[PDB]
């Protein structure tokens, strides 16, 4: 059954709910994002309407193989009437294909369900800027003054220059990036780039990212493992085990690795800054867990709530114990005191 936090009240709509089998009173499903824990339950039998952005419906046509007649793509800061009532899709600047659900309500109550999201400023200049919010569904995953990271930019400026160091240090040396979902694909992307290389992967991996709308990327990526120097790697494999057995795959081609685990936030963050970090080390291969986040610090999630000024706030994430919950409460009571609202 349901939860209440993935219904949207006056309306036929559900957000993220496909593993509850038929939900009563359902006319449409949205799906935020093409991660695992969102899409959990559709597959190819799947009989009912689903509404993404255009990068998930093709996500969903060819690797889940939901049929076509059923995924219904809508392009992003533009109006949309679904089943009598006006939405508009926003960036989420999470993965691709990540989108934020304005729902504006039959009775004049307008709706944000933000999915998976980083926040950030330039989303005060978005579609949001024209009018009032009076319910915010929010991904609260790092809502406590603990979590804290780098932008994306501080941490793909790091990467690029630990591998270019390396590799031209040792023309000899294989890069690696650890990879599970789709999401930070800049950390292989800027790497390869300043290697002057295409990255190499399995076909299955390649497919995925067939479907992301990223421009020139036939330029960028192949199945030709030999040709590159970057490789990707599913994440379990990131340890010196899986390591060294993929080095004895490489026929002699090279004789070190250097490879890279992006994480989400890791408590060495509460230590270390981003320019500090060092790797983990056996022989001649070194593993670095770097902190590229795809959802809001503490700090951005504040400053978006405290624009905002929504009336109710319903947290999407952490909501399973009550510690998390009365955790959750208090932040957002002290920012609305804070900001007067
Ligand atoms: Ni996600």
């Not at 690795?257 to 500090?276: C, E, Q, V, Y």
Request: glycine share 6%.
């Amino acid at each position: 059954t349901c939860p209440f936090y993935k219904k949207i009240p006056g309306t036929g709509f559900t957000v993220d709910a496909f593993q509850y089998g038929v939900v009563e009173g359902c006319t449409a499903y949205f799906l935020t994002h093409f991660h695992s824990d969102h899409y959990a339950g559709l597959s190819k039998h799947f009989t009912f309407p689903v509404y993404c952005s255009e990068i998930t419906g093709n996500l969903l046509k060819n690797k889940l193989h939901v049929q076509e007649q059923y995924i219904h793509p809508l392009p992003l800061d533009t109006e949309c009437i679904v089943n009598g009532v006006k939405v508009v899709l926003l960036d989420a600047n999470h993965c691709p294909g990540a989108v934020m659900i304005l729902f504006y309500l039959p009775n004049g109550t307008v709706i944000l369900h933000t999915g998976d999201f980083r926040a950030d400023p330039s989303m005060e200049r978005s579609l949001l800027a024209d009018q009032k919010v009076h319910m915010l569904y929010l991904d609260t995953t790092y809502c406590s003054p603990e979590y804290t990271f780098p932008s994306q930019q501080e941490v793909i400026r790091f990467a690029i220059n630990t591998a270019f160091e390396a590799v031209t240090l040792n023309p000899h040396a294989l890069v690696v990036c650890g990879t599970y979902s789709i999401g930070k694909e800049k950390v292989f992307l800027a790497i390869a780039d300043v290697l002057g290389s295409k990255v190499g992967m399995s076909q299955e991996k390649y497919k995925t990212l067939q479907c992301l709308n990223i421009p020139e990327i036939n330029s960028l990526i192949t199945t030709d493992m030999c040709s590159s120097l970057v490789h990707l790697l599913p994440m379990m494999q990131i340890n010196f085990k899986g390591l060294q057995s993929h080095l004895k795959k490489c026929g002699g081609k090279y004789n070190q690795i250097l490879a890279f685990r992006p994480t989400g936030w890791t408590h060495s963050n509460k230590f270390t800054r981003i320019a500090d970090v060092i790797p983990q080390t056996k022989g001649n291969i070194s593993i670095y867990g770097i902190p590229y986040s795809e959802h809001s610090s503490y700090l951005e999630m504040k400053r978006f709530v405290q624009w905002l000024k929504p009336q109710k706030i319903i947290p999407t994430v952490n909501v399973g114990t009550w510690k998390s919950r009365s955790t959750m409460e208090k932040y957002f009571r002290e920012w609305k005191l804070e900001a007067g609202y």
